[model samples]
Target: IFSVDKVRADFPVLSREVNGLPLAYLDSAASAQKPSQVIDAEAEFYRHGYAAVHRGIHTLSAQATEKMENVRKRASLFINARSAEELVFVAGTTEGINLVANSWGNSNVRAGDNIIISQMEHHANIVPWQMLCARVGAELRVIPLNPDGTLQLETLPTLFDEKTRLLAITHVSNVLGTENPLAEMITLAHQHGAKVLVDGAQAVMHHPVDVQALDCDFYVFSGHKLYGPTGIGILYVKEALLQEMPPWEGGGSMIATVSLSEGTTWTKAPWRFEAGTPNTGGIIGLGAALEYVSALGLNNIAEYEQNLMHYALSQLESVPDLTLYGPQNRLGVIAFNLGKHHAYDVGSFLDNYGIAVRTGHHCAMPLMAYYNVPAMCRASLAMYNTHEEVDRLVTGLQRIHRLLG
Candidate 1:
């Protein structure tokens, strides 16, 4: 039922050409292409149902508010959160992590407390914690990676202590394609009396995510990476944490009452965190995107992408002097260097052949440093990608090696 060609047809951009050649987009790790379903959902909402949410008694306002709340319920179900109240709409993963760091970190963490994060984390997960630690005089501990780009799980016991307050980690490495053992990591962190925040930005699109099953204190991901529009994302805080965490931002919808003489009273969880007018269009698109993926089935997508990744890995091995990074058992991403050529040059060469790939640190400079490489080229896959596209990428790499190597 999950046909690649049928899925590909849903994405309008795939039908177009780049540089007089059929476009082979390998940059899903950066952001995924939107399907017509998602686009139409947002556009149709704007065309007919546009109004301010949670703001007015007018018919349009009430309708829009109901639709927006429906999205919240849909998203909560998507991640298997305990209830809709646990989900907060954020700008993206970056803003979501920052919310936890600012609101919860400020309240819970103290000078002697420590926060553990992995070296493989995206800057979105790393920088906010760094800022939080610096602000509160806490230490930031990093879980080192193995040579194969997996975490050194043995070292976790040594790093964790009573003073450790939180462990922030990525569910998947956007650069290396490593799918971390999050359940194990979360359990270990919990045993140390530390909460966990899983950055699901790179993980959600490729597989099913259940926040309740993962038992993470906080989970965040971007909608754009999951075949939805930009400017919208989800942040799931456990109900208990949501009840305790203070609102990070203050504005219109977040307050229950505003008075000139009396102090303002704050609303409950979720809304308290979403301080202003919500991204109604983006939220609707995200809801549609979730429905699309669900209809296709996450398990089917995972199985398809896993086979595709294996195919890509095998094809990439044919390129001479191409050093692939990450473990053998990986996910939708493949990062590598072609000979000694700079990543940008290889990427540009591939671009000429209408092959798109990400080149640079891939926003994980720390992981790049670990690999001792200045930059690497990443070819990330999505459900709509095909074997022919992988062949094109491999052919492009071979050409690059012949010319530049």
Candidate 2:
């Protein structure tokens, strides 16, 4: 159902050349490239619908406000949220997680509370809770992973206790590419009266995420990772929880009214969190990007990328002295290191052949230490990527391996 060529054509950058060789962008885990549809969405909005939103009564103001709010409505369907009111826009996943930490966590997480997280989390997920625990005097518990890089779900029960306040985990590992089992994890967390927040920054693009089906307390992801513009992200809180949580930040747009004598009152859930001027262009671009992915069918995209991941894994695994990381059950990303050579040296050599892959700790220093390496090379795929591109990467790595030795 998914045409690889047609998908490839939609992304303009896939055809460009780098260093005299055809560009093979395999660094999507860091940030994905934009499609023309997403690009035009921002441009069209600025050209016709440029005005400050939610604080005006004029024609352009109303139109811009309507368009921006429509992004919330449509993105709700994208993630199957119960209502658009549950969706809050933030700068990125980092801000989304921090909002929950500063507001909801600060309000509920008392001293001696336990916040459970995983070993493979990005610094975004780990650092926020670490700071929260440090301030609140709570304990940070970890769900360790198995030898194969998949989460040790068996150890989950032992970690859950009455003091457990929250379980902050990633839906997928950016470094390992492992798709975590959220439903089971959420059920376990809820049994012990703990809320769950899934960081879907890596998983949202490759899968159809239905928050209701996952039954998570909160979900967050960045637009940039989903092939949309930067500086825009989503946080989906459960409708019931929204009514109880206080505002994360204070600003003009987020307030219902302000008086010198009476102080200030805040707006409802979504707006209460979205303070200050919104990212109109980036939000519009995200709406278009979601629509674009929806039209193509997430199921089809998942299938196409799964095949690519399998092919990439099979080929990369065959290369001599190339040690691959993570389990077989993963999405479109692969992380590995070569013989005794540093990932940076190998990645630099591959760039000469126009093969762009991410190299370093990938903001997961804990994961790097787990593998006993400083860094690993990651080749992440998108639907627009081709079989030929994978082959090119394989050949380039093979050349580098022989040359390194």
Candidate 3:
């Protein structure tokens, strides 16, 4: 186990203080602060060795491309994917789902085809399929939430039918902090001949995902959330499905052959999914982030994060006017509201005290509506967060509550 201070020191941004108080960043769900390793790796890639991936032969170019493709290898290893060719680099989770929805969903979905999406979906997950189903005249199904802020598993069986082609759901709910049953859900979906696409944006830091073990057809997550650079993310598509999906984006490098009349033939497997120059530096840094997280072990990280989060929820809920939202079995994130307190106002107040937390719909307006509020303040944690820091979060919230009242 990494010593808490030793791990904290790796991230230069965490060293920063505000208002003469140490900044308590609890928003890893939105974006994790980058460590010097990832930061330096990305900077060095652009500074000394930068080039396009997969189509280069020069020394610097080969080095850059090697690191870029190594991200695929590393991500595959992290998830124990069937093969590196099963993974595709995209901007983030948003694009990962759209890649499948457009390529596979569009090609396969017809007027009668059914797409199953959960009610807890982020706007990114909800909107694409909504638009796709609307355009193709297909059906979009939703698995509603139970009061505990978790999936009501009983109803899921009914959602599956012969027409069900896809099951789109999150591995963890960003707003409600619910850890989903992916293995069970995927198995059930497969029974109905429906392949599952897991929105792994929230679960990447919380769960151990083996694409082979989960037996999921598709999984997606953002690099930024995993402590890597922005403008980069990854998609793990099963080799079976990758064989069927055409290039969702068209540009150089993705095409095997092109002619004005003959149209275009795309590359095979992973390369077909990647178009243009690619986000080289971002991906190199993403590999470092994945490596860093993996070195700590997902089991260690998840257990540590759960311990820190439960501590936070207890301390915050102990405040007289504070109420923690979401399920008790939260995935290291807690959403809560203060009595008669605007979520933004509370977050800003905490900011003044050098504490950072997210306050908004968290990209789930329907979830916000379900919670019967416009927004709630959120404090999300990762392995980097310490017990002392979680106490500081509690202390800050108490002070802020007093100030508001």
Candidate 4:
């Protein structure tokens, strides 16, 4: 039901040449290339319907507010949130996690409390909680990973205690490409009276997510990586927590009433978290991208990329002196290094062939430490990728090894 050619046509940049070679973009884990549908939707908003939402009394303001709210509903349904009001607009997953740490974490965490995280979290998921623990003098416990890069779930039980207040984890490992056992982890965390927060920056694009089904207390993801615009993301809070958590920031829209001499009463949830002027165009573009992906079907996309990953894995493994990280069961990401060559060198060699891949710790320094490697090269695929592009990546790496090694 899915056609790679048709999907590739939706992305114009895929046709262009990189260093005279055809573009083989394999960096979706960093940021996905935008489709024309998303671009046109964003442009249409700026061209015809531009206004500040929830402020002006004019007709455009009302229309703009309605349009943006409709997109919020789109995002809500995308994640199967309990209600639209439960989804708070954030700048990105970083800010979303930070919002929880500042608003929810500050109120809940205490000196003796323990917070559980895993060995393979991106800095966005790790640092905020680390700061929270440091600020509150709480203990932070980490679930160890097996040699194959999957979580050591047996170790999970030993880490959870009644003193555990929160458990923050990534739905998928951005660097390792390992799809984590979140359902089991969430159940364990909740059994010990801990709230769970999932970083969905990598998971949202590759898989269909239902926050209600997962029963996670918090979920966050970025719009730019979902084939939408930047400066917009989502924070899905359980409605009860929304009522209980304090506001992350204070500004115009999130207030009930302001008194010059006295303090201000706050509005309800969603609006209470969304303080200043919002990026309406980014929201519209995200909605359009979500609609486009929905029409194509997430399951269809997943199946397509599964085949691509299988092909990539087989081809990349055929080379000499190439080491790959993560388990065989993965999403659309593959991280590896070529011989003793620096990851940057291998990445540049691949770039010369017009193939794009991420090279570095990938904001996962702890993972880098676990692997005993300073850096790795990651080729992350998406729905638009084809067998030919995977072939190009294989040939490119082969060339790098032949010349460099």
Candidate 5:
């Protein structure tokens, strides 16, 4: 059992106040607040030892290059990837899916082939396939959500077949806070000879993912959402599938040999995709974030988060006109709406109380439409979140709950 106060101390930003009130950060599902370890690690690199990665011969450059690759090794282990080569650093989950859609989806999926994605998937998981399908002549299939915001996994057997080329699904839904059946879902996809790509942006920090057991083909996530720096993300490709795909970009570092006379030979997928200057400090920060999660322990963190979220939900449930959303096996968050209040208006009221939570469709408009609502208020949790802060949210929401009604 880690001390929540000690964990809280690591995030110096949490000390700041909004509107003369302590910040009860519940927007981690949108993006996690950084611990000081990650903040200092990123700042220290740029402040004391900034240099280009992988393209220089000088000491600073060499060190920076090594640091960047070291981050890959650290991130790979953090995500249970077998090798860092399987972890190709990208911008975020969206780019990771786009990498698959453009590089793998086009090549593997063909005419009459079907790409299946759940109704709860974010646009990041859906748009790429739709675009890829347009080019590949594959049909995009959707697995509808149960009333609880979870997928009916049993329907998967019917959705997947020989024509099924890929299954794009969210590991944990950003809007609904639904914990997906990833381990079982991936196995089902495999049985049907379909490659599974997991959008792990929300799951990576919350759950322990065994990619080998899940046998997930591509797992994608981002640093910012995991309490690290932004603009740097990771894409984990299984060894065999990685070899099957071509690099999306061609540049100096990605080329093993290039000549005007002879055709160029590209390096393997990881290096091949990372063609030019990468985000050096951001990668270093991602390593520090992984260290933070490891030091805290994700399992322990998940337990703590579950407690926080449940307490928060129970309090919100006490509100007379509020209706909570999502599945029975949900993640550490709560999504809800008042019988009569608009989502943004509810968020505005919470803002007045210095409470930080997420509002709107949360990049899952289709799910919002599915629930027959335009948007809702969501409060996501993490290990460091305290029950006291949850009380503050309840205290604040009690005000909104009565005032709006």
Candidate 6:
């Protein structure tokens, strides 16, 4: 019932050519290509239903507010949250983590307390916790990684103690394509009375995520990685945490009552975090994107991508002098270096063949240091990618080897 070709057709940018060759977009881990459905959904809302949401009682405002709330509901269902009230709109995963760090973390963590994070975390997950620890005079502990890019689970128990306040981790490694064992990690943290925040910026697009089932205290992801527009993201806080967590930013909509003499009274959880005019267009586009992925079916997408990952791994293995990073059972991302060539050079060569790939430490300098490489070339997949595109990528690599080797 699910066809990659049919799925590819929905994305308008997929048809275009780059460098006189059909584009092979392998950078979905960085950001996904938007479907026409998502594009038009944002455009249509701007054309017909543009209004300041939650600011006016007129018909337009009411309608816009309804649409915004509808998107919030869709986001809640997409992640299997208990209710929409726990979902807070953020600029992206970075901002979401910052919100948790400043709001809940500042209050919960204290001097002599420790926070745990994995070595493979993106800068977004790492820096926020670092800043939090520095501010509160807490120590930062890390769960080390095996050579295969899997987390060293044995070290986690030693890291957690009575003073552990939080464990911030990633659901997937953006650079190495490693899908972490979040459930076990979260359980371990909870056992130590420490809350866990899962950075799901790389996980949400590849498979379905049940926040309740994961039992994490907080989860964050960006809309751009999930086939929606940029400048919008979701931060899911547990109901109990939301009730207690203070607002990170204060402004127009977040206040229930503003007074010149007396202090302002803040609104409830989610709205309290979203302090200004909401991104109605991005929210609507995210709703449409979620609907489109739902129609395609996440299970179908997951299965298709797993098979594609295996095929890609097999093909990349055949490339001489290529050293793959991460465990064998990775998600849609693949990181490797071709011989002694710099990652930037490999990426540039691939670009000549209309092959798009990410080349760098991938905002994960810590992970790069573990591998002892300055950068790695990453070819990340999505549901819209095809066998032919994989072949084209292999062919491009082959060409690079013949010329550079």
Quote each prediction's TM-score: 0.98, 0.98, 0.96, 0.98, 0.96, 0.99
* Cα misplacement distance, residue 323 of candidate 3 (Å): 1.9
Q: For residues 46-74, could you state the per-residue lDDT of candidate 1 as single tens digits?
A: 99889998858999999999988989999
Least accurate 10 contiguous residues by lDDT in model 6: 175-184
- When summed lDDT is taken over every stretch of 10 residues in candidate 4, the lowest stretch is 310-319
Q: Model 4 segments beyond 4 Å from truth?
A: none
The worst-scoring run of ten residues by lDDT in candidate 5 lies at: 310-319
Q: lDDT scores for all predictions?
A: 0.91, 0.91, 0.85, 0.91, 0.85, 0.92
Give per-residue CA lDDT, model 6, range 309-400, as digits (tens). Answer: 88988888778899998999999899999999999999999998899999989999999999999999999888999988899999888889
Model 2 Cα lDDT, one tens digit per residue, 17-58: 999988999998899999999999899988888999984899
Query: Which stretches of model 3 miss by more than 4 angstroms?
Result: none
Off by over 4 Å in 6: none
lDDT of 4: 0.91
After superposition, the stretches of candidate 1 with alpha carbons farther than 4 Å from their true spots are: none
Candidate 2 global lDDT: 0.91
Q: What digit string (tens of lDDT, one per residue) describes model 5 on residues 276-369?
A: 8888878889999999899989888888877777677767666677778897567866888877889898889888888888899888888998
For model 5, which pairs clash? none
Window of ten residues with lowest summed lDDT in model 1: 396-405
**Cα miss at 104, model 5 (Å)?**
0.6
Q: What is the alpha-carbon lDDT for the whole of candidate 3?
A: 0.85
- Give the local distance difference test score of model 5: 0.85
